[PDB]
Design a protein around this ligand. Structure first.
Ligand code: G39
Length: 659
C-alpha cells in the first residue's frame, strides 16, 4: 500500500506549504490515513500538521486537520460548514516536545474509516484514541474542498494554526490503513522509552506509580502498578509488575507480574474516557498497590506494597481494626467465616486456622500466599472477567477455577475489610521472590495499617536502620527495623493537617536524615531527624515549588558523586499551581551545616506538558534514570490513557542548568 503523496524535510515557520496540486481529488473513497514524522521548533499555540479545507470565505468550518497543543495533546478535526457537523477527536499527553534542550521527533497519524465511522489517532507506536462518531465526515463529505496544505489550515484565504518545525516525512494515503500497520509506521526512538506498554506481558492496558532502584550488583530494577480497569486507584484490579535492566537501562526484560491476585483476570480492558463513562469502575479485585523497594546490607532485596481485599478502597477501609488478634502474646491474622457476624478464627502456626471460641485447630489452613485449604485440599472459587458490550460493562464468572483466598469476596473465611502492608524478599536481585509476609499491626490492634509512600526505602549509614515511608492521612508513619528486617516498629509523627504524606528519605550526614513529603497546602514539606529517625522536627517547606492543594508524590535520592565539590541530592517533582505539569529535576548541594543549596534545575519537557508521579535512581555509570507519569494523573480529563509512563536518562551535565 503506497502513499498518494510523500514529502521529506519540509521546514516551516508558521507559513505552511501549498500541496493542492499534488493532492487535488486524489482521495477517491474519501477515507484517509496521514502519517507525520515531525519535530516542533516552537510549541506555542494550536498547530496543524496539515490541513485539507474549503479555503473560500464563508467556508472556514469546512476542513480536516491534525493538531498539536503546547501540553502535548494530539487531536484532529473534521468539519463541514453547511451541515454544521463538527467532529473533534483527541487525547491529552500523546506527544513529546523537547528532551535535553532538543526537539523530540514524534511520528503521529490519523485514520478516517467510513465503514467503521471512526477516527483514530496514533503517536509513537501507540493508538492513543479511536472514536466512533454519529455525524461522520470524510474528505468527500466535506463540501468544496479546494486547498491541501502542510503546516496549517487555509480558512477564508488565510493560513490558520501555523506549524513551527520540520515535517521530516509525511505520507498521505487514500484509504484507512489497519492498526498494526500504523503502529509500526509510527514506531520510533520514543517508543523505546516505554518499559511497560498496553497489553504487554502484564496483560494491562494501563499503568501508574513507577519505582526505580539500582542494586549493588549493577542491575537497574523497576516496579509499577498495572491498573486493569483504567487508572483509578479504586475500585479497580491492580498488580505490581516488574522489569529490570542489566545493561545500564538500555534494554529491559519483558514485564512480569510479581504481586498479583487472581480473583480477577489480568486482561486488557478498553476503559471509557468520555465525561461520565470515565468514572466507571470494576466492582473491585483483591489488589496490591504503591510499591516500595530497598536493598538490605546483606544484599537481599525487599519489596513492599499496600494490600487491599476485593471491594475495599482507602475510603471504606475500616480505620478501627488492624485485622489482627493478640493471643498469648502473639499477633494472629483474624478471620470471619461466611454467616458469622464476629471474627471467630485466627491463622496460627503453620497456617492452621483455629476456632478462637474453642481454642482448637479446625480442618482449615491458609498457605503462605493466602490460599485456603480444607483437610489439605485447596478450596476454589471461580475467577471474574470484565467486558464491554457495548455501552456497557459486565463482570462475570469466566470458567477459570483459582485457589480460594482470604482476600477474595467469594472466600469462606475473610480478613477484616481494611488495608494491610505486605513484603516479599529476593536473594537473587529480583529474578525470584518469596511468598508475601503481612506486616504485624505496628499501629496497634485497633488501627489499620498505614499507606506506603511509593518509591524507595533507605538504610541509614551510622546505625544500619531500615526506613520505609508511609502515612495515615493525619500522621507520617516511618516504619523501621533495627535487626536487619527480622522485626518492624514505627515512628508516628502527627502532621499539621490531613496530608496525603507520601514521603521519601535522604541522609545528609551520618545520623541525620530528612523526609521530603507531599502536603495539602501546595508546598513540599521536609522534616529532619538528627537521631537516625528516632525523633523528628516540625515541618519546613521548600520555597521554590508551588503546587495545587491536592499535591503530588515526589522522588528524592542521594547521589554518590560530588557536584561542585559537595554531596548532592536529586529531586524530581511537578511544579505548577495549574495541574500536575512542569516536571523539574532539582539538584541540591549539601552545605557544611546540613542546609541545602538548591542550585540547579532542569525542566523535563515544556512546562505545560504533564508530569505526575516520578522515581529517580542513580545508574551504575553515575547517570540518572527517571521513570515518570507523563500526564496529569489527578485530572479527570487524563484518566485511562495508554503508554504514558516513560523511562529517560540524564547525565549530570544535562541537569546542571538554570544557575
Ligand atoms: C487521594 C489521596 C489518597 C491517599 C489517602 O490516594 C493516593 C493518591 C494518589 C494520587 O494522588 O494520584 C495515588 C495513590 N496511589 C493513592 N493511594 C492510595 C492508597 O489509594
Amino acid at each position: 500500500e503506497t502513499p498518494v503523496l510523500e514529502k521529506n524535510n519540509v521546514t516551516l515557520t508558521g507559513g505552511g506549504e501549498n500541496v493542492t496540486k499534488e493532492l487535488k481529488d486524489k482521495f477517491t473513497s474519501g477515507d484517509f490515513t496521514v502519517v507525520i514524522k515531525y519535530n516542533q521548533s516552537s510549541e506555542k499555540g494550536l498547530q496543524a500538521l496539515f490541513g485539507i479545507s474549503n479555503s473560500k470565505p464563508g467556508q472556514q468550518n469546512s476542513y480536516v486537520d491534525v493538531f498539536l497543543r503546547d501540553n502535548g495533546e494530539l487531536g484532529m478535526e473534521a468539519r463541514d460548514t453547511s451541515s454544521n457537523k463538527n467532529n473533534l477527536v483527541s487525547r491529552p499527553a500523546s506527544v513529546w516536545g523537547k528532551y535535553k534542550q532538543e526537539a523530540v521527533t514524534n511520528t503521529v497519524a490519523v485514520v478516517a474509516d467510513s465503514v467503521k465511522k471512526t477516527y483514530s489517532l496514533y503517536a509513537n507506536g501507540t493508538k492513543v484514541v479511536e472514536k466512533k462518531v454519529d455525524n461522520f465526515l470524510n474528505i468527500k463529505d466535506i463540501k468544496g474542498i479546494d486547498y491541501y496544505m502542510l503546516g496549517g489550515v487555509k480558512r477564508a484565504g488565510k493560513t490558520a494554526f501555523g506549524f513551527n518545525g520540520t515535517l521530516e516525512n509525511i505520507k498521505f494515503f487514500n484509504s484507512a490503513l489497519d492498526e498494526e500497520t500504523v503502529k509500526k509506521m509510527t514506531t520510533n526512538a520514543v517508543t523505546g522509552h516505554l518499559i511497560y506498554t498496553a497489553n504487554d506481558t502484564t496483560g494491562s492496558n494501563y499503568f501508574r506509580i513507577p519505582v526505580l532502584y539500582t542494586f549493588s550488583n549493577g542491575r537497574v530494577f523497576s516496579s509499577i502498578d498495572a491498573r486493569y480497569g483504567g487508572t483509578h486507584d479504586f475500585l479497580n484490579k491492580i498488580n505490581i509488575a516488574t522489569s529490570y535492566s542489566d545493561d545500564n537501562g538500555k534494554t529491559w526484560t519483558k514485564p512480569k507480574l510479581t504481586l498479583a491476585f487472581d480473583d480477577f483476570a489480568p486482561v486488557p480492558l478498553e476503559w471509557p474516557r468520555e465525561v461520565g463513562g470515565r468514572d466507571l469502575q470494576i466492582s473491585g479485585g483483591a489488589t496490591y498497590i504503591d510499591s516500595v523497594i530497598v536493598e538490605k546490607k546483606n544484599k537481599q532485596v525487599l519489596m513492599f506494597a499496600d494490600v487491599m481485599p476485593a471491594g475495599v478502597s482507602f475510603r471504606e477501609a475500616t480505620r478501627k481494626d488492624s485485622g489482627y488478634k493478640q493471643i498469648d502474646g502473639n499477633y494472629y491474622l483474624k478471620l470471619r467465616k461466611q454467616g458469622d457476624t464476629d471474627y471467630n478464627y485466627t491463622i496460627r502456626e503453620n497456617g492452621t486456622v483455629y476456632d478462637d471460641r474453642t481454642n482448637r485447630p479446625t480442618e482449615f489452613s491458609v498457605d503462605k500466599n493466602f490460599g485456603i485449604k480444607q483437610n489439605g485440599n485447596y478450596l476454589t472459587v471461580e475467577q471474574y472477567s470484565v467486558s464491554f458490550e457495548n455501552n456497557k460493562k459486565t463482570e462475570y464468572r469466566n470458567g477459570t477455577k483459582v485457589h480460594m483466598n482470604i482476600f477474595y469476596k467469594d472466600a469462606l473465611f475473610k480478613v477484616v475489610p481494611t488495608n494491610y502492608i505486605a513484603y516479599i524478599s529476593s536473594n537473587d536481585h529480583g529474578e525470584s521472590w518469596s511468598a508475601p509476609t503481612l506486616l504485624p499491626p505496628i499501629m496497634g490492634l485497633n488501627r489499620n495499617a498505614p499507606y506506603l509512600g511509593p518509591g524507595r526505602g533507605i538504610i541509614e549509614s551510622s546505625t544500619g536502620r531500615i526506613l520505609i515511608p508511609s502515612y495515615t492521612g493525619k500522621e507520617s508513619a516511618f516504619i523501621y527495623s533495627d535487626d536487619n528486617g527480622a522485626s518492624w516498629k514505627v515512628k508516628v509523627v502527627p502532621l499539621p493537617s490531613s496530608w496525603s504524606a507520601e514521603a521519601q528519605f535522604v541522609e545528609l550526614s551520618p545520623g541525620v536524615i530528612q523526609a521530603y513529603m507531599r502536603t495539602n497546602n501546595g508546598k513540599i514539606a521536609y522534616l529532619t531527624s538528627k537521631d537516625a529517625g528516632t525523633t523528628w522536627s516540625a515541618p519546613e517547606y521548600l520555597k521554590f515549588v508551588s503546587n495545587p492543594s491536592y499535591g503530588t508524590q515526589l522522588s528524592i535520592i542521594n547521589y554518590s558523586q560530588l557536584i561542585d565539590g559537595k554531596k548532592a541530592v536529586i529531586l524530581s517533582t511537578p511544579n505548577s499551581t495549574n495541574g500536575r505539569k512542569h516536571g523539574q529535576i532539582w539538584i541540591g548541594l549539601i552545605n557544611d551545616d546540613n542546609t541545602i543549596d538548591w542550585r540547579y534545575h532542569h525542566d523535563v519537557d515544556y512546562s505545560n506538558y504533564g508530569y505526575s508521579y516520578s522515581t529517580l535512581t542513580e545508574l551504575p555509570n553515575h547517570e540518572i534514570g527517571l521513570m515518570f507519569e507523563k500526564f496529569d494523573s489527578w485530572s479527570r480529563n487524563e484518566l485511562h490513557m495508554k503508554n504514558v509512563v516513560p523511562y529517560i536518562t540524564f547525565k549530570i551535565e544535562d541537569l546542571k542548568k538554570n544557575l
